[PDB]
Design an enzyme around this catalytic site. Structure first.
Site, mmCIF file in Angstrom:
data_model
loop_
_atom_site.group_PDB
_atom_site.id
_atom_site.type_symbol
_atom_site.label_atom_id
_atom_site.label_comp_id
_atom_site.label_asym_id
_atom_site.label_seq_id
_atom_site.Cartn_x
_atom_site.Cartn_y
_atom_site.Cartn_z
ATOM 1 N N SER B 64 37.826 -0.908 38.688
ATOM 2 C CA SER B 64 37.335 -1.058 40.058
ATOM 3 C C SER B 64 37.787 0.016 41.039
ATOM 4 O O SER B 64 37.276 0.087 42.162
ATOM 5 C CB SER B 64 37.697 -2.438 40.624
ATOM 6 O OG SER B 64 39.066 -2.519 40.966
ATOM 7 N N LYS B 67 35.040 2.141 42.362
ATOM 8 C CA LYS B 67 34.123 1.671 43.392
ATOM 9 C C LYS B 67 34.009 2.510 44.661
ATOM 10 O O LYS B 67 32.902 2.787 45.120
ATOM 11 C CB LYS B 67 34.446 0.218 43.737
ATOM 12 C CG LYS B 67 34.199 -0.735 42.566
ATOM 13 C CD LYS B 67 34.518 -2.172 42.930
ATOM 14 C CE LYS B 67 34.349 -3.090 41.739
ATOM 15 N NZ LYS B 67 34.736 -4.490 42.063
ATOM 16 N N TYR B 191 27.876 0.261 35.253
ATOM 17 C CA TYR B 191 29.080 -0.082 35.992
ATOM 18 C C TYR B 191 30.314 -0.216 35.088
ATOM 19 O O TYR B 191 31.419 0.128 35.498
ATOM 20 C CB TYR B 191 28.838 -1.378 36.775
ATOM 21 C CG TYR B 191 30.090 -2.037 37.291
ATOM 22 C CD1 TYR B 191 30.826 -1.471 38.336
ATOM 23 C CD2 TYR B 191 30.573 -3.203 36.695
ATOM 24 C CE1 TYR B 191 32.017 -2.049 38.767
ATOM 25 C CE2 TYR B 191 31.759 -3.786 37.117
ATOM 26 C CZ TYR B 191 32.478 -3.205 38.148
ATOM 27 O OH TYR B 191 33.674 -3.767 38.523
ATOM 28 N N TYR B 243 41.658 -7.663 49.755
ATOM 29 C CA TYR B 243 41.319 -8.950 50.359
ATOM 30 C C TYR B 243 42.149 -10.175 49.953
ATOM 31 O O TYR B 243 42.520 -10.986 50.806
ATOM 32 C CB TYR B 243 39.844 -9.269 50.114
ATOM 33 C CG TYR B 243 39.254 -10.195 51.151
ATOM 34 C CD1 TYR B 243 38.871 -9.707 52.399
ATOM 35 C CD2 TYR B 243 39.099 -11.564 50.902
ATOM 36 C CE1 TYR B 243 38.350 -10.548 53.374
ATOM 37 C CE2 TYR B 243 38.574 -12.422 51.881
ATOM 38 C CZ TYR B 243 38.204 -11.900 53.113
ATOM 39 O OH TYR B 243 37.691 -12.711 54.100
ATOM 40 N N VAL B 261 42.174 -3.452 37.169
ATOM 41 C CA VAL B 261 42.808 -4.311 36.175
ATOM 42 C C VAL B 261 43.475 -3.591 35.001
ATOM 43 O O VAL B 261 44.116 -4.230 34.163
ATOM 44 C CB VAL B 261 41.822 -5.365 35.611
ATOM 45 C CG1 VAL B 261 41.384 -6.313 36.722
ATOM 46 C CG2 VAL B 261 40.631 -4.678 34.960
#
Ligand SMILES: N[C@@H](CCC(=O)O)C(=O)O
Ligand SMILES: N[C@@H](CCC(=O)O)C(=O)O
Lengths: 438, 447
Positions: B64, B67, B191, B243, B261
């Site tokens: 991620s 991103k 992705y 978040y 991760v």
């Protein structure tokens, strides 16, 4: 020559002032009857200036724009642990959900929302301060930052106190979970009186400037708030101040702000400017329409944003000159981590003590030492490498042009000087205002 | 001598490395079987340095942390309108609620969550790009900022593609609402490959520094992304990057970040540093344990925060000296609004005008403000106004200013806003009858 900033603001006021959408707050007559034909704006800069335009000298109740200052006060009066126990940091809109108290973090979400604001006022002076002491405190902090004694518009106070069921509701709920120890009426009254404090666009600008500079009053250089408290405040304003505005404020505008239902919008952009805007009428989300729009225009026309990299960096190095066996290294500006990191680079660049094959482009760039520094903002750090005939025996570290510096910067440079000496180099520090120690 | 920062990092690695809580990503065997005993960290500065310690050179899949970069590429390739139509700016955690798509715009909340990351990949090159073209584009944007050709760890790709029911679910739901046009499998595969791109702690730092500087590569000075795009990316990272971490990241740490991760953490603090941290094991919320704890320490030890005021400000004015009828006004640093305001202040401070300036405030009303404005130099240093005060000092009993030398040689660069302001201030100076000769060797003032 007249300063061009104020002319821009006047033009902006004239342009956006051509219309007046929305309507004044209706919740109370004193605010609804308010003359809508007003529009002012002001900019308070760290450079001690106050560029203004329009109805910038007209007083108006600060309303919830007061939340960030009473918050600062509470943090100063009770310390972070005491405040955070009652007030959360969770971004949120005004709508109340009991789960924030019954579950989740078990306390109001943040200080920008009424529930938080109530808890904050309750915290003000101390565990056993009186109703009057706490109000005096709320009026005091806003006054100290504004730079003048502010007053409460009691006409507005009474008007609102007659229609405060919602706030009483939140207050009663908070009591229920231990967040408020005093009565609902006492706290709501303090909070309402607090919102009734009268300020002008200029006042707000100066007040926001104090936060923008990290707690330093731009007009006197006197530290009003600990930089740690000022940061917390602006952070919270960023996360929830404009929570329900159109789009996403941080990404769109990047100027931490808060609006008051009387029409005043407070802005505070770290290291650059404090903003104050006055426009009675509100848009449908409850923020000053033109007030909001003015802020969006400031952000775009001047290209201001929280995310832009306008830092001192390598400019912390004014210059590095060599005379035979000794090098003169002059520092300058407001030196914090970034400034100090550059200084160390300059010191290490004096050869007193990634793989180039993998990154050929990186090498051809570091070859033109001055050009790379120009494109990145390394100031005069490159000059050090230029200095490094014979061996360097002395290095004079001059801090005359250094405005100030934090302990982090003090610690890094100090450690830097130590390692220079550990190389057999004599280091004499010319520090006329002696700001390096401690 | 040795630069202290790298040694600071080493101590920190040894310290935080005394323990190794949490566990590796259990969702795929490749990541679950990775050597847990690894901990590296790197900092990439705008100056062009790369301070690091520990296993800062061990490759791992960026996951991620990819991103923010694919999102940048999409904005560059498609423009804000096109992307904003499919990728929202609403802050949210990874938990998915179909409601977020039932809105009038029909789009996942933001580019930091999977749903959004999927929407991003779909936008990568153009309306008609092919699968291979988009993947190539993702790998490219990341390679361009890292400064080297990166590669996809296909062993990791396969492993995860065998257990992508959740992302396949988001992709399908997004198709249902018109956010995705191609098959769910095609976009999810893209992705996942994107997440299999191999990077090191050092790579992340450099990559992050690129955003931190507003889109300029710290090692070359070349602009990799329009500043307007870099800001959008860091803003979004700030709002949703961490978040669900403990406390409130922006307030407590203030370093826009994103964890992967596989154990890598990306950092980007505007104008100061690009951060890369690597520690395989994750905490309860799914972020690198030591990786996160390392960012907290960097924030506290170096007092780094998105909200601190580290601006050029008055320092934009190097000095203001005077010789009879002429004044030498030298500028410096990276000038944008902040610096330009300070410059206009210096120009105006020279009393070349026939009228007397309007203070805006009443001296009789603010006696404290007058006393301070009296010791002009003290007020300046306590503020951070650099040399702007030397202007008023130059104005301060015999002879009108006839010439002003505006030297920009020490100026690194100026943005259009400051370029416009200074140009206007110069015009007004001449309107006063003052001769202005601009010593601009690198011609940075025009346009
Ligand atoms: N005094 C108002 C707050 C006004 C505002 O939101 O600025 C209230 O507590 O309802
Ligand atoms: N590739 C992972 C994301 C890893 C991360 O959250 O950093 C997934 O979609 O499950």
């Amino acid at each position: 020559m007249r300063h061009p900033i104020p002319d821009y603001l006047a033009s902006l006021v004239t342009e956006l002032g051509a219309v007046n959408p929305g309507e004044t707050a209706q919740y109370i007559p004193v605010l609804a009857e308010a003359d809508p034909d007003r529009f002012g704006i002001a900019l308070a800069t760290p450079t001690g200036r106050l560029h203004c335009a329009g109805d910038a000298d007209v007083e108006f109740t600060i309303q919830s724009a007061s939340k960030p200052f009473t918050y600062a006060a509470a943090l100063v009066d009770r310390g972070f642990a005491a405040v955070d126990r009652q007030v959360g940091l969770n971004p949120s809109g005004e709508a109340f959900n009991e789960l924030s108290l019954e579950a989740e973090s078990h306390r109001p979400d943040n200080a920008m929302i009424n529930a938080g604001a109530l808890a904050v006022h309750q915290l003000l002076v101390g565990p056993e301060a009186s109703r009057k002491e706490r109000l005096d405190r709320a009026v005091e902090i806003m006054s100290l930052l504004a730079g003048r004694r502010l007053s409460v518009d009691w006409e507005t106070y009474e008007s609102e106190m007659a229609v405060s069921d919602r706030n009483l509701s939140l207050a009663h709920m908070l009591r229920s979970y231990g967040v408020l120890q005093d009565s609902a009426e006492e706290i709501v009254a303090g909070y309402v009186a607090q919102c009734a404090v009268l300020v002008t666009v200029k006042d707000l600008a100066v007040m926001g400037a104090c936060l923008a500079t990290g707690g330093i009053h731009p007009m006197t250089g006197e530290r009003m708030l600990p930089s740690i408290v000022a940061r917390r405040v602006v952070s919270v304003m960023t996360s929830s101040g404009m929570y329900d505005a159109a789009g996403q404020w941080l990404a769109d505008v990047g100027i931490p702000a808060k609006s008051g239902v009387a029409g005043g919008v407070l802005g505070a952009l770290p290291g650059r400017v404090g903003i104050g805007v006055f426009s009675p009428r509100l848009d449908e989300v409850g923020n000053s329409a033109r007030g909001v729009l003015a802020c969006r225009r400031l952000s775009e026309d001047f290209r201001l944003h929280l995310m832009d990299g306008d830092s001192l960096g390598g400019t912390a190095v004014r210059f590095v000159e060599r005379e035979g066996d000794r090098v003169f290294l002059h520092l300058q500006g407001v030196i914090r981590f970034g400034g100090a990191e550059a200084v160390l680079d300059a010191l290490t660049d004096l050869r007193t003590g990634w793989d180039a094959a993998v990154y050929p482009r990186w090498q051809e760039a570091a070859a033109d030492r001055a050009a790379l520094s120009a494109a990145t903002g390394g100031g005069a750090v490159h000059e050090a490498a230029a200095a490094a005939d014979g061996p360097i025996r002395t290095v004079v570290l001059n801090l005359a042009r250094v405005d100030r510096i934090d302990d982090v910067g003090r610690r890094l440079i100090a450690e830097g000087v130590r390692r220079l000496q550990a190389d057999g180099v004599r280091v004499e520090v010319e520090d006329p205002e002696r700001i390096l120690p401690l």
